[PDB]
Design a protein around this ligand. Structure first.
Ligand SMILES: CN1CCN(CCOc2cc3ncc(-c4cc(N)nc(Cl)c4)n3cc2S(=O)(=O)C(C)(C)C)CC1
Ligand SMILES: CN1CCN(CCOc2cc3ncc(-c4cc(N)nc(Cl)c4)n3cc2S(=O)(=O)C(C)(C)C)CC1
Lengths: 275, 275
C-alpha cells in the first residue's frame, strides 16, 4: 500500500493574505507561499469539518478536482491551502456578459465534458464519493479555462441556493446528475435558472411539482450544436424520478461524440477570444 | 495527519495500449482508462525501482510535477500510470525545427520559470527530494504547454545522456542546478549541447576540464531578452565548483522580474502560434 501525507504549511509561510470571498463552506483568501513563490488559495470543534474536506481533496485527487497543496493546522489558524484559480468560477464566466461578451461552443462543451469527467471519477471511487453541492460557483477555471471541482464540505462517501438540488432532497446518489442537468442548462442558455421567481420557496414548489428551467428558442436557441442530444441529456438529467436519471458514464458516452466534432485549436482560440 | 493511498489499476482497465517511446527509465505507452474515460500514459528486484518511483510521484505532487494516477502491479504486468502529455517533451519542442519553426521568448521563459518552480518545490520538501536526472526529455508539456517534470527513477531523498550531469559524478545536492543551466542554454540556443563532439567520453573529459556549451553570437544571439542576466545565471549554474552554483530560490529571484516584462496574452499567442 503506497501512502502520501498531506503537507503541513505553517501560517508564517502564507504571506500577502488578501481576502477573496466568504461562503457557507468558509472564507476564501489569496496568499503567496514564502518558500514556493507561487500564489495560493486558502479556505478558513468546527475544525473537524475542514479536516474532513481536506481529507476528501487529498483522496479524490484527479485532473478535474481542485488540487490541495497542504493544510494549515495551528492553535491560532486553520485553513485548507490549494491551487489558485486565476479565472475564478463558471458562474462568473457565464453571467459576466460585459467582461466576457463572447463565449464559444467548443469551450462550453469542453467545460461540460470536464465536469462530467471529474464527477464520474468521484462516482467510480471505492466507496463512491458523492459531491452533493455542485453549483457553477464550485466549478472553478484555471488560467487556460479547465475545470476544477471544489467545495467538498457537503460531499459524502456512499457506504443557500437550492436551484441545483433535486426535489426529493427538500422534504425529510442521483443528486449530482440533477445538479449537472441544471448546470448544463445554465451553460448552454447563459441564463440564471428561475430568474422570473423572487421567492426560493416558489422555486421549490414549482420543481417538486415537476417544473424545470424553460426549454424554447428564447432560452436555448436552435443554433446550439447537437441541441436535441443536449435537451435529451438535460431532461433525463433533471427527471422527477431519480431512477430515470442517467449515470455520468452515460453523460460521457453521449458527450464524447459531440466533442470529437471540434478541432483542438478551436478551444485554444475560444480561451484567447475571451482575453 | 491526512494520508492518501495510490490507486491500483487492473491491467484490463488500460484499453488501447499503444507504444510511444522506450528509454532508460522504461517503456512509455498510451492507454485509455476503461472506467474514467480519459487517455493516460503508463511507464513499464526491477519491481522495487518502479514502486519507489511511483511513491516519489505520489509524495512529490505539485503543479509542475507529472500527476500520477495510479499503479498497475500484477504478476503479469507492472507499470506506473499517470496523466497523458499531448505535446510530449521540451526536447521535441526545441529540436523539431520543421514542426515548430517559431517558438516565442514568453513561452521559452515561462517554461524555464516553471522548471525552476517545480525543482524548487522538490528541494523545499522535508526531507528535500533531489531529481538527479533532469533532461529536456523529462520536461513534459501539457495541451497548453505547461511544464510537468518526469523521470524520478534516479531521484533521491536528502536525509544514457551525461550532458546534464555535473563533472563530480562521472568517476565513482548541486546536481539539479547543473542540469538546469544546460537546459537553460539549450532552450535559449535551440541547439544540442556538445553537438560538435562525437564521442561521449570526450564530452565527459572536456567538462571535467571546465568545458561547457559555447556562449557567443552564433550560439546565443544578442536579440535574446535579458541575455546578460541569462548568461550570468547559466555560468553560475554550471560552475565547476559545486559550492559556487546557486539555489533554485536564487534562479526564481532572478527569473521573476524577466517574466514580469511579458504580458499574459503573449503566452497564449505563443502557444497558438505553434498550433
Ligand atoms: C472580485 N473577484 C473575485 C474573483 N476573482 C479571483 C479568482 O477567484 C477565486 C480563485 C480561487 N482559486 C481557488 C479558489 C477556491 C474556491 C473554493 N471554493 N475552495 C477553495 Cl479551497 C479554493 N478560488 C476562489 C476564488 S473566489 O472565492 O473569489 C470565487 C468567488 C470566484 C469562487 C477575481 C476578482
Ligand atoms: C511531438 N510529439 C511526438 C509524440 N508525442 C506523444 C507521446 O509523448 C508522450 C506523452 C506522455 N505523457 C506522459 C508521458 C510519460 C513520461 C514519463 N517519463 N513517465 C510517465 Cl509515467 C509518463 N508521456 C511520454 C511521452 S514520450 O515518451 O513519447 C516522449 C518521448 C515525448 C517523452 C506528442 C507530440
Amino acid at each position: 500500500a503506497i501512502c502520501s501525507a498531506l503537507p503541513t504549511i505553517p501560517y508564517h509561510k502564507l504571506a500577502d493574505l488578501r481576502y477573496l470571498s466568504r461562503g457557507a463552506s468558509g472564507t476564501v483568501s489569496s496568499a503567496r507561499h514564502a518558500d514556493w513563490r507561487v500564489q495560493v488559495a486558502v479556505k478558513h470543534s468546527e475544525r473537524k469539518d475542514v479536516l474532513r474536506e481536506a481529507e476528501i481533496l487529498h483522496k479524490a485527487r484527479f485532473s478535474y478536482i481542485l488540487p490541495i497543496l497542504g493544510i494549515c493546522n495551528e492553535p491560532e489558524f486553520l485553513g485548507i491551502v490549494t491551487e489558485y484559480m486565476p479565472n475564478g468560477s463558471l458562474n462568473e464566466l457565464l453571467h459576466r456578459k460585459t467582461e466576457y461578451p463572447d463565449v464559444a461552443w467548443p469551450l462550453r462543451f469542453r467545460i461540460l465534458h470536464e465536469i462530467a469527467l471529474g464527477v464520474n471519477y468521484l462516482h467510480n471511487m471505492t466507496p463512491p464519493l458523492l459531491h452533493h453541492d455542485l453549483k457553477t460557483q464550485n466549478i472553478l477555471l484555471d488560467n487556460e479555462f479547465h475545470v476544477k471541482i471544489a467545495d467538498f464540505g457537503l460531499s459524502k462517501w456512499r457506504m443557500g441556493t437550492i436551484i441545483y438540488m433535486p426535489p426529493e432532497n427538500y422534504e425529510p446518489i442521483k443528486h449530482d446528475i440533477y445538479s449537472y442537468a441544471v448546470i448544463t442548462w445554465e451553460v448552454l442558455s447563459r441564463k440564471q435558472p428561475f430568474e422570473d421567481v423572487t421567492n426560493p420557496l416558489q422555486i421549490m414548489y414549482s420543481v417538486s411539482q415537476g417544473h424545470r428551467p424553460v426549454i424554447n428558442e428564447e432560452s436555448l436557441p436552435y443554433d446550439i450544436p447537437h441541441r436535441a442530444r443536449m435537451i435529451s441529456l438535460i431532461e433525463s438529467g433533471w427527471a422527477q424520478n431519480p431512477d430515470e436519471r442517467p449515470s455520468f458514464l452515460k453523460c460521457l458516452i453521449e458527450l464524447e461524440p459531440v466533442l470529437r466534432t471540434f478541432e483542438e485549436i478551436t478551444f485554444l482560440e475560444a480561451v484567447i477570444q475571451l482575453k
